[PDB]
Amino acid sequence: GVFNYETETTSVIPAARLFKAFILDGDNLFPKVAPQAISSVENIEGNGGPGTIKKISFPEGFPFKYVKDRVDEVDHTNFKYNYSVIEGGPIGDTLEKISNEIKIVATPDGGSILKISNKYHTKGDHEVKAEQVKASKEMGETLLRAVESYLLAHSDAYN
């Protein structure tokens, strides 16, 4: 069945720039700016659009070694990005996939709001523990803050 987690966070980066950096170029950026959170991102197949498969490796000592994610949909117009964790880490005999969606909305003060949904698709009568969900949120925030600090410090990047 499906368990749906939604949350919102704020960013000081304008929506379009954050979408370009955080969402579209997360592959180069995350391991560069947050090597303590993500060790590497490997493009396995595809050119970044729907169906593209990436292997995200975590630093030694993390609960999970890696996941493979699949890009589902990339909407530049509405700054919406849909992708699924499809293998590795928590995925297996109790969890089929995690379907995620982020929408980035502009705020009048020049910042943005990130609206996030994580949909856990389980197998059988296994439920999703809050510990799994909190972990996802805190890494989300860790990557956002590290990317933020990098976009603030490198003004000529992703304009």
Side-chain angles (χ1 to χ4, degrees), residues 1-124 127-128 130-159:
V2 187
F3 302 78
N4 185 26
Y5 299 101
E6 308 153 301
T7 187
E8 294 181 16
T9 184
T10 70
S11 171
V12 295
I13 305 305
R17 187 162 182 243
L18 189 63
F19 191 80
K20 190 168 166 189
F22 182 75
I23 296 289
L24 302 185
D25 207 31
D27 310 333
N28 159 62
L29 255 193
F30 292 155
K32 175 155 68 154
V33 314
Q36 77 286 358
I38 302 300
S39 163
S40 69
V41 183
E42 179 176 22
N43 251 57
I44 298 308
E45 201 76 38
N47 211 349
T52 295
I53 301 300
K54 310 172 181 183
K55 184 175 177 182
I56 297 79
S57 292
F58 303 105
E60 200 174 3
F62 272 61
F64 301 123
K65 186 175 191 176
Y66 66 80
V67 289
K68 279 175 201 293
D69 292 355
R70 179 191 66 204
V71 178
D72 294 319
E73 199 163 78
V74 181
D75 181 356
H76 292 64
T77 290
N78 300 299
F79 301 139
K80 283 193 247 214
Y81 182 82
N82 292 261
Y83 64 99
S84 293
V85 178
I86 59 161
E87 193 177 0
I91 307 300
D93 60 17
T94 71
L95 184 60
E96 271 175 43
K97 69 164 173 191
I98 313 177
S99 302
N100 305 322
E101 178 173 337
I102 303 172
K103 185 162 69 171
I104 307 186
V105 311
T107 60
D109 65 14
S112 57
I113 289 166
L114 292 81
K115 308 194 173 175
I116 304 133
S117 167
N118 306 132
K119 285 166 137 148
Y120 291 75
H121 292 249
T122 57
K123 292 186 146 144
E127 60 151 14
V128 176
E131 70 192 43
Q132 189 79 45
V133 179
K134 302 314 186 174
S136 73
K137 199 170 284 182
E138 57 179 273
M139 177 162 73
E141 290 284 3
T142 294
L143 296 165
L144 179 52
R145 301 318 164 188
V147 171
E148 280 190 320
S149 179
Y150 190 96
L151 290 173
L152 295 172
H154 301 80
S155 65
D156 301 327
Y158 305 104
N159 305 306

